[PDB]
């Protein structure tokens, strides 16, 4: 809408208080005009009709518990936008400052979140397996990174390219959680998953196998569930990114870590520069070795760690 930019305050899903950019014209709207063409948050009102209605508030205070998922969806889309701009000189998900849109309160008891080709969508969860999914910065950044991938490499969402697509979203969701320093870890979804059971998460990058995901290519899922395992085989790539960043020994292969920023730069370059829609894990290894080389030299430690890590997880 057209109006005056202002700043509101509210409480997120985990009860933390934060400031949000709003726009005022009779009502206060969750419309942030300070980032590209804007960040817009919508109420789907427990239906599946999208996007729903632009979130309108009477007094620019967002402390109702109904408001909480909107506060976080709005705030964390902003943080993710800033991460891509400041760390990678990318303006929004398309590189040309496209509007970021999210809808919350999608359906009833819906335990998921997704990018639907045009916008992000967040369920409220059923209160026992999930609470509102936008309460996790790694969840928000994961979903938005799907749009980034769609505008760049265009990884097909099935089999090995699909697992790559999933892993890139886990990798970057984590790097964003670290960038914002929101209690970071190498776990996915720990803040919003199973409120009655602490210390667990949906997926683990540091040890995928903790939840039954492969951490080695020999162990990959070859059937047809989950579009050929896209959320399952991502574990192999997730473990690789973890080793590359933090180091460690995995099936007897030692890896010297090169830290997060270099992991980010290497994978962002692979993604934007070398990956294609049909790329497989072997092509990802090559893309990553080539980015490292481009960035740090044919005989750098960095290139050596990237080689080490992919060997460790069985990807030649
Ligand atoms: Ca209010
Ligand atoms: Ca965390
Ligand atoms: Ca996490
Ligand atoms: Ca939990
Ligand atoms: Zn995903």
UniProtKB/Swiss-Prot annotation:
GO molecular function: metal ion binding; metalloendopeptidase activity
Superkingdom as given in the UniProt entry: Bacteria
Record field: temperature dependence: Thermostable.
Binding residues annotated for Zn(2+), in chain numbering: 142, 146, 166
Binding site for Ca(2+) 4: 193-194, 197, 200
Keywords, in A-Z order: Calcium, Hydrolase, Metal-binding, Metalloprotease, Protease, Secreted, Signal, Zinc, Zymogen
Cellular component annotations (GO), alphabetically ordered: extracellular region
Catalyzed chemical reaction(s): Preferential cleavage: Xaa-|-Leu > Xaa-|-Phe
EC top class named in words: hydrolase
Cofactor note: Binds 4 Ca(2+) ions per subunit.
Enzyme Commission number, as recorded: 3.4.24.27
Compartments reported by the entry: Secreted
Binding site for Ca(2+) 2: 138, 177, 185, 187, 190
A Gene Ontology BP annotation from the UniProt entry: proteolysis
Protein name, as recorded: Thermolysin
Record organism: Bacillus thermoproteolyticus
Lineage summary: Bacteria, Bacillati, Bacillota, Bacilli, Bacillales
